[PDB]
Amino acid sequence: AHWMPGEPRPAYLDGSAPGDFGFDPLGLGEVPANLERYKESELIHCRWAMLAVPGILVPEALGYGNWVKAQEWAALPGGQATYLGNPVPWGTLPTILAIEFLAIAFVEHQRSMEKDPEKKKYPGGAFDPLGYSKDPKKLEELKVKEIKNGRLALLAFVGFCVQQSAYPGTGPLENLATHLADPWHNNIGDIVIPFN
Amino acid sequence: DISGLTPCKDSKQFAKREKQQIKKLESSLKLYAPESAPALALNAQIEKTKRRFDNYGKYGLLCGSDGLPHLIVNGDQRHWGEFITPGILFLYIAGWIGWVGRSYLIAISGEKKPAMKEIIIDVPLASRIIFRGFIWPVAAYREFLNGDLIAKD
Amino acid sequence: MRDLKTYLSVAPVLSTLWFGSLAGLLIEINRLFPDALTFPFF
Amino acid sequence: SHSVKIYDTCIGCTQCVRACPTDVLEMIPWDGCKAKQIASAPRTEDCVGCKRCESACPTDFLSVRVYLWHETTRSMGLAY
Amino acid sequence: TFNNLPSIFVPLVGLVFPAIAMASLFLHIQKNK
Amino acid sequence: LSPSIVISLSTGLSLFLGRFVFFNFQRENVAKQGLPEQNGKTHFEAGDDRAKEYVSLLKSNDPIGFNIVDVLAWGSIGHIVAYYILATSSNGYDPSFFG
Amino acid sequence: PPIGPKRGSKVKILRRESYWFKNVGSVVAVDQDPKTRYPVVVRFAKVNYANISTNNYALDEVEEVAA
Amino acid sequence: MALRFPRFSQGLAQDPTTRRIWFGIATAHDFESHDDITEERLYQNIFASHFGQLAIIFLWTSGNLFHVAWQGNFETWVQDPLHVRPIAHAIWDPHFGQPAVEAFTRGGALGPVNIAYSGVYQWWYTIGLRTNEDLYTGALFLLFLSALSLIGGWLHLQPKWKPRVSWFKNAESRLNHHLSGLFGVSSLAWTGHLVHVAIPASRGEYVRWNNFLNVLPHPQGLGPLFTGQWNLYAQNPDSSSHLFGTSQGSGTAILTLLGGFHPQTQSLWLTDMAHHHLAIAILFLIAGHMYRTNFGIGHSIKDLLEAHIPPGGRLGRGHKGLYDTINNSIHFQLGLALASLGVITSLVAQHMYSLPAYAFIAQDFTTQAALYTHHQYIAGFIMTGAFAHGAIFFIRDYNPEQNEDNVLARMLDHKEAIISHLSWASLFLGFHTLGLYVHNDVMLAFGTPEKQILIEPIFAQWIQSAHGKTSYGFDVLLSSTSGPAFNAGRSIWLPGWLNAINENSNSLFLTIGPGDFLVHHAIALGLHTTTLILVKGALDARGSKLMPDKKDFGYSFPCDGPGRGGTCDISAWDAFYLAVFWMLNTIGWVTFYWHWKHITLWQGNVSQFNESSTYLMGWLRDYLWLNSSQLINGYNPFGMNSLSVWAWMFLFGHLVWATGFMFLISWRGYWQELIETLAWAHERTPLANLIRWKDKPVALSIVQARLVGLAHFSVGYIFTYAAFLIASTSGKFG
Ligand code: CLA
Ligand code: CLA
Ligand code: CLA
Ligand code: CLA
Ligand SMILES: CC1=C(/C=C/C(C)=C/C=C/C(C)=C/C=C/C=C(C)/C=C/C=C(C)/C=C/C2=C(C)CCCC2(C)C)C(C)(C)CCC1
Ligand code: SF4
Which residues take part in binding [4Fe-4S] cluster 2 (chain D)? Predict the structure, then answer.
């Protein structure tokens, strides 16, 4: 377990934590309270991004959008979201912002008030149906799996955002389609090396 | 054509400046005999002027409304030769000097009275140290990595 | 010559020799490559 | 008038007194140095402020120390 | 008499008030309680 | 939506967040900062006989401790967000991004 | 026992008000009297602004350098 | 307390010499150093002095208003503004000769008068204030406010209302009130003026105190505001044809965000400024309710500073303990205050010329030059004072044991790095700026201007092209139509802003060139070097290797004697004093650049500046020698003209700028040994032994004479350049 074999491990990164492959070049997690805050925020970023990747790929495969087309309707005054074709009757810009704020603020601020640093990241109980917590010998494996898939989804979200930045008006499945059609001449190389 | 500047081989004001300076030299050339030495020096200056303007034409210099070569120092490759290719050629040479005079100061730092080598330069030691700064950038790089570049007080 | 090389090693004599050589170098370069404003040799 | 305070870093070299053109300073007995003497300053009211005392003090910074203060006719170097 | 008012006040502030202030402040400068 | 509805809904949803959601965070941050300390002592403790924290205005009854000053605060945020909504909606402005 | 450094020991200075602050020096001599407040005479390679290369320093205004 | 005139100091009162007089004048407002002083009495004297300053400010503004109301042609100026000269005040000089009365009669006046180059005409005309009775009423009201401030300053010195030391140290309630009320309610009230008065005044009708409760600033009236339909206040923007002062082409809107200039006045829209002051009023009223005062909510600035300690300790202890080194230290407060004030004064100068707010203030050219020069020299002085008071804080008020390892002690931990890298930046800038200027001087000298090093300012032209200036072809965020910036603002303000900035005749984002690059780097040299001197004096205020006990000698002291090589000008005061020279040089550069760029724009030949600003004989010939002809011809042997006073003031400023050199070059010791001979001669001259001084006539003190030389120097600098910049800009007026 090491992000780069041959590099020395930080003394505070032993490998016991889930996904602790010793990757701290800049030295951010040197004090332990910041490291617990960073673990909580890593898992939060991870869970949001890996929930987001289906919400980006699926509505582009079948939902008739491309994950930014789902936002353009709010940029134009007059027009509401096309949740699978049908328009939503819950208003367009301001009231969805009200519901989003009033819902996620309550959820995330009931998350904030937790003091146990393990429940701050792995609460369980109501958030653990199906009883996938009653055996730590596999729960550690599942925590490593969560961390790994979540870091993968975070990198995939960088892929989404930067493929949107390089190609302004497309989506990731269109990028994969272009790479499956002509894989050599339609890759990143035309952007890292701009011809003009 | 960056920064709203026509190139100097195409700028009419640049050619007008050339013709004005050439006429200013020719009006001073009439007062001398065509075979005399002042006249030949003026003619050499005339050819120097003409090929100077031709060279500012061919080297991609950009001329403004005033009709003078402006330097685009931003980073455009077309004009690296205006600032960056000289600039590196400065930072090399300058960094030669400082890497020499520093190294010399480290080589006469361990003397008994090291101040009588500041005012009386050891030419053998200085000549040994001078070419050490030829490939100075790798020495400075490694001394930065080895910590020998910064004294530890 | 002993103690003449120490005098010629002194900072002003050595500075005038170095800057005379250097100034002649720059002067002959500007004779060879007059009126330079770019480095086109790459 | 002025305030010529001295400090215990004095080594008893007697050079500030020998520089003083107004007899502000005077060596006294002391036990804090190899020379077993230190430079007092009783006649501070006669101090002009010329700081010859501290232009002759061979310490790391200074032992005798002139702090310019209320200027009287004796401290303004006035013969009138 | 309103074009005559500058002629009243420019001396009264510029000659008279400066004499008043200079005298009074010179007395205040040299006073001793 | 009529402006009275907008003002009432946004104010209600602001002091609802203040009464129930963002109460313990605001109050614990208040206790954390505590008081303005002039040289260790507070402004009133050091003197000045005018910076006394008023308690006749903060003593109001509530099982959780809501006071009239929080009613003004959550409610100033309320009217502010409401008027932001109202003016932003009443201004027929086209952002027209990318087109 | 002789107090302080030795008559050739290298030393550095922790006196804030000195010219040679955080600069090394050579201990000339240490006065063994336990009544002189500044016994450690130090010699420095470079002069101060008063063209003086030495001053007496205290024991706690000095630090025996490990070089 | 004491006996003689410096009652506040019994050390100068017990001084037989003339130094008593001078030093009692100088140290009069240094309440921190007086006898029998307490922090309470210091704060109370400061408060009463602030009241006195506010009283003098309102009195000076009342004087402006009275002398424009009595002796001004303001009623005639509001008819044809851009072709009628303002009148500052009349002139009754009994030394004037009849030609000088014939010459100084301007503006259609009954006698000789002075031309208001201050812009009070334009500003007053823009905010309403049409007839002279309005200016009379304003002067009466500001006399009333002067008396009110005097009353307050006397009242808050009596024991029944003397505020306590812990009341001036309430650094949360004061910020709360000043942000909310002094900054927010005042901007709100200025919006109230611009809406009830200045916009109706620009659109004809004269809404005054008698008829402002029964006229509607907007035809609906508080329906839009209360109902939230605020767009109704931006309905009729009096588009593109409005004649200022008349109802032709007028509108009904009061807060429309249009951007850009009026077409007629070439100033900003009063609706724009109304909406502006309203917006910042909301922002300042919001920002006020931040600091906890009495009510159980808000922040404590302590636990914001104490809490901003970064983990990892890159700063150290952070701001732990910085509330106490500012709340208890008035010199830190004053340094920060003057820093912000100098920054925003420079901002005032830099925005009032490029975004002129007043009607027909861009059309009178001498006014803009006088205003920019004024506010920039004021800003440079205020900045120099910010730093001087930081040095005085480091000496008098800084407690290192209270702020160990915090973000402020870390300055002194590595002050050598700051000072040496400022000494690198300034040295680089000067070496290269001067090298390029001298290269171009020599190229123009050798008749080869094509060999000049004309480095285009691509990085400022790119910013201009990021604002809509289509003069460089960079096609950036607001010069490119296909962009997010030219889409989210193309419907609100970018029309007017683009049509204003693209106009080559106004001062908004002037077309720059290589001379602008070179002079901007001269400006950077000036700022970096003044900063170097001031920062070096502030951080070496407590001590250095040459004088580690400097804190014990105070801020201003002459020297530390000739010993230790020589300690001339070692104080932090001396650093300030040298930095005033470098500051005046810096502002002279920025204002020479401004005035030549603008006089070439106003004349029409921008090509003159663009081809002549790259070499210094162009600045000496085509700016100083060329534009000073009509000035120095203010009085010739065969007559004089209206610029005679500016020629005389020009030479006067030269004379005192040279007299400062007497005190700066010639130092004491020569003068004491001269005045000793003079005292001998007076005591031995018959019929003058009768007369004898009471104060023994000593020469000027050393630090005093540095101050006096600096005062003569700066007075001459300022008067010379004021005379030249007004005479040249008023001899031709563009
Ligand atoms: C700091 C500001 C500054 C700058 C940037 C310049 C820049 C320049 N000036 Mg100006 N000048 C300045 C100040 C400045 N000057 C001042 C202050 C004066 C008055 C004293 C002048 C007076 C002046 C005159 C009168 C003239 C110039 C000229 C020039 C040009 C020099 C051409 C030349 O001979 O170099 C050629 C290059 C060299 C001499 C360097 C050679 C270095 C040696 C050979 C070592 C390099 C090789 C090395 C071993 C590395 C190789 C790599 C590897 C294989 C090892 C150049 C544009 C001349 C010109 O052409 O006008 C435009 C000219 O006629 N200048
Ligand atoms: C011999 C030279 C001389 C003298 C003495 C004067 C005298 C005067 N001129 Mg000037 N003038 C002169 C030559 C001279 N003129 C020349 C050659 C020209 C060019 C043609 C002019 C052009 C000119 C103009 C254009 C104007 C004057 C004005 C004035 C008057 C100023 C009003 C006044 O006293 O306010 C009081 C004076 C002051 C506030 C200035 C003094 C400032 C002091 C030094 C600074 C403060 C120091 C300190 C705080 C106080 C210490 C003193 C204390 C004891 C009171 C005054 C009569 C003005 C006038 O008449 O308007 C009313 C006016 O507008 N003159
Ligand atoms: C809301 C209530 C309130 C208000 C209005 C004020 C107002 C003021 N207080 Mg404060 N004060 C308050 C509450 C308040 N205070 C409380 C509660 C306390 C106790 C904690 C204090 C304690 C206190 C002290 C200790 C002092 C003051 C001072 C002052 C005065 C500041 C000096 C000045 O004129 O700045 C004017 C500055 C501005 C209006 C800011 C303008 C800056 C902008 C950004 C500039 C650019 C725009 C420009 C205005 C346009 C010009 C164009 C043209 C019109 C010229 C001012 C009268 C000082 C004073 O002068 O005492 C008399 C002083 O010493 N106050
Ligand atoms: C024209 C006058 C002038 C000039 C050139 C300078 C130049 C300088 N001053 Mg300023 N200064 C001046 C007037 C001037 N000062 C005045 C009147 C005062 C009031 C007392 C001050 C007060 C002052 C202070 C208080 C400070 C400075 C600083 C500096 C340096 C700033 C860094 C810089 O630009 O260096 C770039 C170098 C130059 C501009 C030097 C120009 C000369 C050329 C480039 C050198 C080569 C010439 C030639 C080849 C030599 C041959 C001649 C000979 C051997 C035959 C620099 C040496 C600061 C400083 O030194 O710190 C860095 C500082 O702290 N000065
Ligand atoms: C000595 C001292 C002192 C004094 C000092 C001083 C005087 C300082 C000054 C300072 C200054 C005088 C500063 C200034 C600064 C500035 C800055 C820092 C800026 C920034 C900016 C920015 C950040 C920007 C941004 C932007 C832009 C670019 C434009 C548009 C908009 C935006 C926002 C985007 C004190 C008392 C403190 C203390 C003690 C020491
Ligand atoms: S202060 Fe100077 S003169 Fe006096 S004893 Fe010390 S070293 Fe000698």
Answer: 20, 47, 50, 53
